[PDB]
Design an enzyme around this catalytic site. Structure first.
Site, PDB file in Angstrom:
ATOM      1  N   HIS A  60      40.108  43.569  61.912  1.00  0.00           N
ATOM      2  CA  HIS A  60      40.624  42.832  63.058  1.00  0.00           C
ATOM      3  C   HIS A  60      41.099  41.448  62.622  1.00  0.00           C
ATOM      4  O   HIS A  60      40.291  40.579  62.280  1.00  0.00           O
ATOM      5  CB  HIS A  60      39.534  42.716  64.129  1.00  0.00           C
ATOM      6  N   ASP A  62      43.110  38.132  63.770  1.00  0.00           N
ATOM      7  CA  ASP A  62      43.631  37.338  64.873  1.00  0.00           C
ATOM      8  C   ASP A  62      44.751  36.405  64.446  1.00  0.00           C
ATOM      9  O   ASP A  62      44.577  35.599  63.536  1.00  0.00           O
ATOM     10  CB  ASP A  62      42.515  36.493  65.481  1.00  0.00           C
ATOM     11  N   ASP A 174      39.856  44.151  71.171  1.00  0.00           N
ATOM     12  CA  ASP A 174      39.318  42.834  71.514  1.00  0.00           C
ATOM     13  C   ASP A 174      39.733  42.163  72.828  1.00  0.00           C
ATOM     14  O   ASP A 174      39.072  41.215  73.256  1.00  0.00           O
ATOM     15  CB  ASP A 174      39.552  41.850  70.362  1.00  0.00           C
ATOM     16  N   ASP A 311      35.844  41.678  62.039  1.00  0.00           N
ATOM     17  CA  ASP A 311      36.829  40.604  61.902  1.00  0.00           C
ATOM     18  C   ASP A 311      37.186  40.296  60.453  1.00  0.00           C
ATOM     19  O   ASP A 311      36.310  40.060  59.621  1.00  0.00           O
ATOM     20  CB  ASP A 311      36.320  39.321  62.566  1.00  0.00           C
ATOM     21  N   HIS A 441      45.430  37.616  72.191  1.00  0.00           N
ATOM     22  CA  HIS A 441      44.263  37.447  73.050  1.00  0.00           C
ATOM     23  C   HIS A 441      43.453  36.155  72.855  1.00  0.00           C
ATOM     24  O   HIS A 441      42.368  36.004  73.428  1.00  0.00           O
ATOM     25  CB  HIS A 441      43.335  38.679  72.978  1.00  0.00           C
TER      26      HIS A 441
HETATM   27  O1  LIG Z   1      39.499  37.075  69.009  1.00  0.00           O
HETATM   28  C1  LIG Z   1      38.278  36.526  68.469  1.00  0.00           C
HETATM   29  C2  LIG Z   1      37.140  36.550  69.526  1.00  0.00           C
HETATM   30  C3  LIG Z   1      37.560  36.391  71.027  1.00  0.00           C
HETATM   31  O2  LIG Z   1      38.183  35.113  71.241  1.00  0.00           O
HETATM   32  C4  LIG Z   1      36.284  36.546  71.921  1.00  0.00           C
HETATM   33  C5  LIG Z   1      35.557  37.895  71.642  1.00  0.00           C
HETATM   34  C6  LIG Z   1      35.237  38.024  70.128  1.00  0.00           C
HETATM   35  N1  LIG Z   1      36.509  37.873  69.364  1.00  0.00           N
HETATM   36  C7  LIG Z   1      36.512  38.221  67.949  1.00  0.00           C
HETATM   37  C8  LIG Z   1      37.701  37.443  67.328  1.00  0.00           C
HETATM   38  O3  LIG Z   1      38.692  38.348  66.850  1.00  0.00           O
HETATM   39 ZN   LIG Z   2      40.282  39.129  68.317  1.00  0.00          ZN
END
Ligand SMILES: O[C@H]1[C@H]2[C@H](O)CCCN2C[C@H]1O
Ligand SMILES: [Zn+2]
Ligand SMILES: *[C@@H]1O[C@H](CO)[C@@H](O)[C@H](O)[C@H]1NC(C)=O
Length: 1014
Positions: A60, A62, A174, A311, A441
């Site tokens: 994952h 971000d 997520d 992550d 997100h």
């Molecule tokens: O997006 C980040 C975060 C989110 O902001 C809240 C839930 C847990 N997530 C894991 C990360 O990837």
């Molecule tokens: Zn995330």
């Protein structure tokens, strides 16, 4: 066309109905804390019926969160992708899925040719598989469907061009809660399967018990089921390894081999993973297989999905080895031990779904149907994630502004083919990508660290500038005589004038049109209308003189109104919030009429004295202890008085009454009708002094909101023939009600300042007998019925308000449309409320590592529509959907896609034309050309232009609504050689249209067409 109003779909699971029946008890279920002790019959599986297990490795990533996109790319992602290429290349049986194309594209373009080839090979052979394929994994609450489509298209178009693949399976692990807008778009984009994860723990338990975690997700209004998309909902608390192998995280954690020590990771359940050996493999397998079989009990087929990731995982080579080697040992043992009756292997998401449907076709399983959404999410106890529906509201509003600028830029430039030197494609790609990135997100959600939010803002700022450049260049070319047109692709022929962004009081950015006998007598301005129907709308510009008159290009006079330029200031000395008027700048307002998807030119001319067709607004400043307010050349003197109730009426529109505090109190639709009670009020929510604290994600109020102490606020009343308004300086908010003849527009200049642990809410109180029912929209696409549940805490009754909400009884309805996504609810019959901003001092323990203390002034905009609905044909009491009226729909369009305004930069515009698109068809009001995008560069012999057509559904309330032309987007451009219906991403041709005519779509339907021109 299916009837989306009168036929209540028959589904196995309808989320609103389910919510009504569920008890939501949060009891300790044992190792599976939010479930129960799963039991299974060991004899269920045997030599003739084995459990097929697919372990799907994932990472994952971000595109920004606690680090910026680039920071993550440099520190983690490029290494993850580099080592993935190497490891998959060297280990043919290893698999890996990837979702974020923004990162992949960044990586791929940096790769050498040799590596690009190796990468294409492992994708072609099925080892590396893209899931969803969007630029990002978007938020599903605040995002507008148009931008969800934009980012999906951006990612998939890249994939088709460079990887020669188009994902048909979606992966969303997520986002904080899930929306049916996703399957809607995906199913119309060639998808066949989708997976979701973050849903209320109570819902997971309920569906698990009925083995309804996999279902055919159809839209709430879909009676036939053609919108259905197979969906797999994960059953547990998280997508990490401890919560993906089975119900017991203490056991599953032992199978995340990156947690043995050297990586700085460990298992909180106190039992570490142990390297698999010939000596312990039998015992380790027995434990693992047991978890698998328990998880398998929650589903209907003999095919089991086991995600393996977390992550930014699979970064180090050592990590790839430790996970792959240990799992290979487990697979060899398990698959060779008949008594297990299991066949396990690494797999991809698509492989899992293909197997599931193979089992389905074999007749071993039938799947339930379902409609509804999965908001509001709660991961545990009373921790409902409704806070992010509002967090960082400045950027949430910026999202909607950029959304429109992108559409306008792509549409305006689509009419012509441009030379590469114009850098049109370049600027548009940048704009689409920065907006797409923000759909992440942790972007629009307002859940990123302060410096990351700044990065997103900077990126969007550059995108806005890119859009302006493309738009102004396009306007110049579209409205200048061809033989005179002489473009300098770096020159600014026009400057965009936006009266609502950043907004007055937020940033003095708009230019003043400076006119004068000794400098410049007149100035040309141009309005653009991106909507496919003729549209009239008042527009305003700042001018250096109040003595200005307006005319169209035929020199016909246009009625105008001039008002002062008022700015509110927090007087540090007098400790009062009051308005100051400019003595050198003034606002000129007039009605612009623009062709469908066209342009209209006007001229502003100065005169020595008051022009015949320009009127001047009166101004009344209500407050005690007033001081003079000079306004330079402004014709009328400001009047003063003590605070008092006032009433206003513009044109033949409604009559509005305000309290002495400058707040709405009642609305009278007609001179005959009564004064319907509609009161605006501002309140504040606090934070709990004990237990869990509210943060960027969580909304944990310390009880119902408390009224904001208003004191004796200063009220400014401006009355004009075309526009009147009432503005008041309240603590943290300059509240403004603007009237132009129809539903009023509301603007809030919100500056929460340093009010820590405070959430400001704007509430409407009425006599509407709505009870416990209210409606909110999903991604600006559909309106879904909500039911306030007192069995749930206050924060659970808050829902996303991406573009609108309404309440109604048998006779009256009140609809509030927004120009930005915010959180809201109806906490009592007859009420509507929506949060303006929130400032939280503490972190809510979800990983952000900070509270929300970076608030900045933001101008929120709305339209408030009060209507009689007793004559409207509405859905039955059991229908899960709701629909807007024509007025409410048009009001929403006025906020999200207003006319664009251009001011000619130079002194003279040679070859200027007065209009473009007068011949464009004016389509029925419920139809919109959501996207118009030329898909080919100038060198292409056959030019292609893509269109996304969306038809909403408006209630029929007895209004004739006639005379409208059929819109055939395939003939908008000349020399059409072919017309094809395509997926919404324009990537696959679905139909060859005879006569080269693109037929309009059905209510609530969206289609895409591509026209080819020789
Ligand atoms: O997006 C980040 C975060 C989110 O902001 C809240 C839930 C847990 N997530 C894991 C990360 O990837
Ligand atoms: Zn995330
Ligand atoms: C793309 O994939 C298809 C598989 O359907 C194949 O037929 C085609 O040759 C490929 N094109 C290339 C070389 O990218």
């Amino acid at each position: 066309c299916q009837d989306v109003v009168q036929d209540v779909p028959n589904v196995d699971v309808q989320m609103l109905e389910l919510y009504d029946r569920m008890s939501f008890k949060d009891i300790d279920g044992g190792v599976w804390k939010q479930g129960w002790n799963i039991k299974y019959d060991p004899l269920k599986y045997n030599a003739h019926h084995k459990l097929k297990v697919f372990v799907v490795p994932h990472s994952h990533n971000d595109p920004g969160w606690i680090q910026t996109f680039e920071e993550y790319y440099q520190h983690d992602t490029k290494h993850i992708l580099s080592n993935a290429l190497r490891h998959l290349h060297d280990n043919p049986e290893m698999k890996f899925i990837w979702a974020e194309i923004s990162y992949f594209a960044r990586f791929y373009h940096d790769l050498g040719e040799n590596k690009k080839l190796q990468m294409k090979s492992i994708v072609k052979n099925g080892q590396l598989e893209f899931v969803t394929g969007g630029w990002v994994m978007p938020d599903e609450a605040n995002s507008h469907w148009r931008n969800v489509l934009l980012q999906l298209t951006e990612g998939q178009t890249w994939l088709k061009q460079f990887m020669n693949v188009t994902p048909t399976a979606s992966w969303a692990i997520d986002p904080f809660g899930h929306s049916p807008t996703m399957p809607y778009i995906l199913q119309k984009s060639g998808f066949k399967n989708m997976l979701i994860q973050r849903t209320h723990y109570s819902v997971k338990k309920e569906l698990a018990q009925q083995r309804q975690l996999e279902f055919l997700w159809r839209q709430i209004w879909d009676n036939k089921g053609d919108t259905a998309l197979f969906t797999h909902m994960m059953p547990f608390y998280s997508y990490d390894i401890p919560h993906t192998c089975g119900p017991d995280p203490k056991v599953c954690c032992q199978f995340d081999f990156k947690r043995m020590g050297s990586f700085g990771l460990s298992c909180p359940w106190k039992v570490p993973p142990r390297t698999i050996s010939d000596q312990n493999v039998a015992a380790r397998s027995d434990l693992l297989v047991d978890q698998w079989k328990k998880k398998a009990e929650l589903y209907r087929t003999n095919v089991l999905l086991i995600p393996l990731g977390d992550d930014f995982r699979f970064k180090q080579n050592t990590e790839w080895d430790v996970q792959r080697v240990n799992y290979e040992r487990l697979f060899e043992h398990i698959n060779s031990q008949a008594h297990f009756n299991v066949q396990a292997q690494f797999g991809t998401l698509q492989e899992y779904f293909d197997a599931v449907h193979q089992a389905e076709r074999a007749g071993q399983a039938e799947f339930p149907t379902l409609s509804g959404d999965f908001f509001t999410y709660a991961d545990r106890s009373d921790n409902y994630w409704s806070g992010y529906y509002t967090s960082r509201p400045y950027h949430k509003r910026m999202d909607r502004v950029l959304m429109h600028y992108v559409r306008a830029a792509e549409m305006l430039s689509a009419w012509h083919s441009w030379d590469g030197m114009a850098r049109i494609e370049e600027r548009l790609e940048q704009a689409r990508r920065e907006l797409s990135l923000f759909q992440h997100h942790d972007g629009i959600t307002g859940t990123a660290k302060t410096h990351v939010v700044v990065d997103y803002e900077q990126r969007m700022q550059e995108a806005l500038k890119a859009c302006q450049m493309v738009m102004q260049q396009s306007v110049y070319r579209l409205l200048t005589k061809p033989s005179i047109y002489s473009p300098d692709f770096s020159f600014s022929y026009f400057t965009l004038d936006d009266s609502r962004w950043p907004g007055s009081g937020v940033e003095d950015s708009r230019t003043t049109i400076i006119l004068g006998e000794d400098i410049l007598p007149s100035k040309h301005v141009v309005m653009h209308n991106t909507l496919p129907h003729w549209r009239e709308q008042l527009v305003d510009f700042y001018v250096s003189s109040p003595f200005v008159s307006v005319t169209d290009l035929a020199n016909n006079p246009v009625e105008a109104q001039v008002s002062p330029v008022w700015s509110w200031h927090h007087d540090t000395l007098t400790k009062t919030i009051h308005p100051q008027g400019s003595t050198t700048k003034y606002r000129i307002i007039f009605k612009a009429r623009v062709p469908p998807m066209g342009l209209a030119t006007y001229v502003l001319t100065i005169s020595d004295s008051k022009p015949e067709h320009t009127s001047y607004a009166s101004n009344l400043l209500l407050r005690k202890n007033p001081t003079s307010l000079p306004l330079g050349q402004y014709p009328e003197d400001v009047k003063f008085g003590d605070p008092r109730e006032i009433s206003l009426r513009v044109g033949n529109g409604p009559t509005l009454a305000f309290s002495e505090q400058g707040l709405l109190k009642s609305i009278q639709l007609t001179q005959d009708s009564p004064h319907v009670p509609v009161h605006f009020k501002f309140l504040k929510y606090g934070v709990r002094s004990h237990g869990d604290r509210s943060g960027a994600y969580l909304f944990l109020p310390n009880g119902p909101a408390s009224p904001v102490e208003l004191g004796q606020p200063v009220v400014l009343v401006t009355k004009g023939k075309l526009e009147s308004s009432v503005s008041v300086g309240l603590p943290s908010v300059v509240h403004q009600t603007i009237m132009r003849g129809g539903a009023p527009e509301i603007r809030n200049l919100v500056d929460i300042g340093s009010l820590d642990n405070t959430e400001i809410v704007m509430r409407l109180e009425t006599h509407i007998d709505s009870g416990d029912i209210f409606y909110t929209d999903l991604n600006g696409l559909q309106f879904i019925k909500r039911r306030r549940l007192d069995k749930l805490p206050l924060q659970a009754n808050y829902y996303p308000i991406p573009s609108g909400m309404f309440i109604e009884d048998a006779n009256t309805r009140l609809t509030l449309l927004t120009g930005q996504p915010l959180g809201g609810s109806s906490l009592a019959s007859g009420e509507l409320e929506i949060m303006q901003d929130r400032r939280l001092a503490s972190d809510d323990e979800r990983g952000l590592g900070q509270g929300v203390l970076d608030n900045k002034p933001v101008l929120h905009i709305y339209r408030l529509v009060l209507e009689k609905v007793n004559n409207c044909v509405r859905p039955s009491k059991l229908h899960p959907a709701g629909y807007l009226t024509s007025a409410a729909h048009k009001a929403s369009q006025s906020l999200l896609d207003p006319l664009d305004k251009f001011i000619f930069a130079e002194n003279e515009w040679i070859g200027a034309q007065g209009q473009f698109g007068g011949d464009h068809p004016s389509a029925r009001e419920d139809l919109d050309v959501s996207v118009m995008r030329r898909l080919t560069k100038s060198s292409a012999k056959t030019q292609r232009v893509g269109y996304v057509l969306h038809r909403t559904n408006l209630m029929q309330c007895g209004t004739p609504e006639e005379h409208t032309q059929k819109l055939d987007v395939c003939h908008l451009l000349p020399n059409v050689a072919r017309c094809e219906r395509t997926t919404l991403t324009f990537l696959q041709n679905l139909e060859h249209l005879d006569g080269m005519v693109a037929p309009e779509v059905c209510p609530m339907e969206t289609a895409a067409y591509v026209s080819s021109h020789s």
